[PDB]
Design an enzyme around this catalytic site. Structure first.
Site, PDB file in Angstrom:
ATOM      1  N   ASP A   5      -7.034  -9.134   5.653  1.00 51.71           N
ATOM      2  CA  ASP A   5      -8.291  -9.871   5.524  1.00 51.71           C
ATOM      3  C   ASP A   5      -9.499  -9.086   6.018  1.00 51.71           C
ATOM      4  O   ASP A   5     -10.383  -8.731   5.239  1.00 51.71           O
ATOM      5  CB  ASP A   5      -8.222 -11.187   6.297  1.00 51.71           C
ATOM      6  CG  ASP A   5      -7.833 -12.361   5.423  1.00 51.71           C
ATOM      7  OD1 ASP A   5      -8.269 -12.396   4.248  1.00 51.71           O
ATOM      8  OD2 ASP A   5      -7.102 -13.254   5.913  1.00 51.71           O
ATOM      9  N   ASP A  27       0.830  -1.214   0.000  1.00 49.11           N
ATOM     10  CA  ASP A  27       0.000   0.000   0.000  1.00 49.11           C
ATOM     11  C   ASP A  27       0.871   1.275   0.000  1.00 49.11           C
ATOM     12  O   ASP A  27       0.715   2.155   0.835  1.00 49.11           O
ATOM     13  CB  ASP A  27      -0.927  -0.014   1.226  1.00 49.11           C
ATOM     14  CG  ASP A  27      -2.156   0.893   1.069  1.00 49.11           C
ATOM     15  OD1 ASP A  27      -2.260   1.631   0.055  1.00 49.11           O
ATOM     16  OD2 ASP A  27      -3.030   0.868   1.978  1.00 49.11           O
TER      17      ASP A  27
END
Ligand SMILES: Nc1ncnc2c1ncn2[C@@H]1O[C@H](COP(=O)(O)OP(=O)(O)OP(=O)(O)O)[C@@H](O)[C@H]1O
Ligand SMILES: O=C(NOCCO)C1=CC=C(F)C(F)/C1=N\c1ccc(I)cc1F
Ligand SMILES: [Mg+2]
Length: 260
Positions: free
Chosen positions: A156, A129
């Site tokens: 997740d 990211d």
């Protein structure tokens, strides 16, 4: 060591997809910290996992990684406490700064690639990211990385807009890895250089956009206005192909950073 009642809201630093971050004061210690609340509707077993996996962040010391103090859970909201960087994120700096100079982007690149390789070598994790808002700067002239993927479970649980800094290959399938971060950096330095999200080249809907980055040729740096060395650097990051694309070793000894 860190608790919810032991804190005191000072101001609000900014917000994103799933997290809000406050400038806060840790009463017992006097330290000014940044606290990130992530709202997660989640069961006790996993709520504990994420926390347990965040401990690794105590072992993440580098001048290129944002400091970590602790993580805990408090009423439907998981908390990550970190170094307050009093300069904000490069996305902010860019907004207020129009465009960021090649020479500075040079110092930024050094830091990002040093940061990435530290997370790789010492901790065997990709960032996942990287983009202007996950690179923080401070008044001591430090340039650190945050919001990298230390906890599988938290990635997740957060399975859930406009711009994407995801690589062609990550966009296309699950066949991606550390090489994917390089593309992100590539795209981010191009953004900060020209002052605008570099796709499409100088108002675009989701597929238009996503289709451009995977099927259309990569963005390049404007010509003549940037050194040939900056160009080659970005160019080697933004190569569609993961295997052909520059890896972290190669960029460390690239001309552009050498000059920097
Ligand atoms: N440790 C920190 N010190 C100072 N400012 C911070 C810190 N962490 C985040 N911020 C600021 O607050 C904002 C919070 O960002 P957050 O990660 O919650 O969303 P984002 O990363 O900006 O975007 P998104 O979640 O959409 O990818 C950032 O834009 C940055 O300006
Ligand atoms: O913040 C994240 N994503 O940002 C999305 C907006 O909330 C994260 C996603 C996955 C993780 F494993 C994270 F730890 C993580 N947060 C941090 C990771 C390292 C530091 I130093 C500080 C962090 F806050
Ligand atoms: Mg962030």
């Amino acid at each position: 060591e860190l608790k919810d009642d032991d804190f005191e809201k000072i101001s609000e630093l900014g917000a994103g997809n799933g997290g809000v971050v406050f400038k806060v004061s840790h009463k017992p210690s006097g330290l000014v910290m940044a606290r990130k609340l992530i709202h997660l509707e989640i069961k006790p077993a996993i709520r504990n996992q994420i926390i347990r996996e965040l401990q690794v962040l105590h072992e993440c010391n580098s001048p290129y990684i944002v400091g970590f103090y602790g993580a805990f859970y408090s009423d439907g909201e998981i908390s990550i406490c970190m170094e307050h960087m009093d300069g904000g994120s490069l996305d902010q700096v860019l907004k207020k700064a129009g465009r960021i100079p090649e020479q500075i982007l040079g110092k930024v690149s050094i830091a990002v690639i040093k940061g990435l390789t530290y997370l790789r070598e010492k901790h065997k994790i990709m960032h996942r990211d990287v983009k202007p808002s996950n690179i923080l700067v401070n008044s001591r002239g430090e340039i650190k990385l945050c919001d990298f993927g230390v906890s599988g479970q938290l990635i997740d649980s957060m399975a859930n807009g406009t711009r994407s800094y995801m690589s062609p290959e990550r966009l296309q399938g699950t066949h991606y890895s550390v090489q994917s971060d390089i593309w992100s950096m590539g795209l981010s330095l191009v953004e900060m250089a020209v002052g605008r999200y570099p796709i499409p080249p100088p108002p675009m809907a989701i597929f238009e956009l996503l289709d451009y980055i995977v099927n259309e040729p990569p963005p390049k740096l404007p010509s003549g206005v940037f050194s040939l060395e900056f160009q080659d650097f970005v160019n080697k990051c933004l190569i569609k192909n993961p295997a052909e694309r520059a890896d972290l070793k190669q960029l460390m000894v690239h001309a552009f950073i050498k000059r920097s």
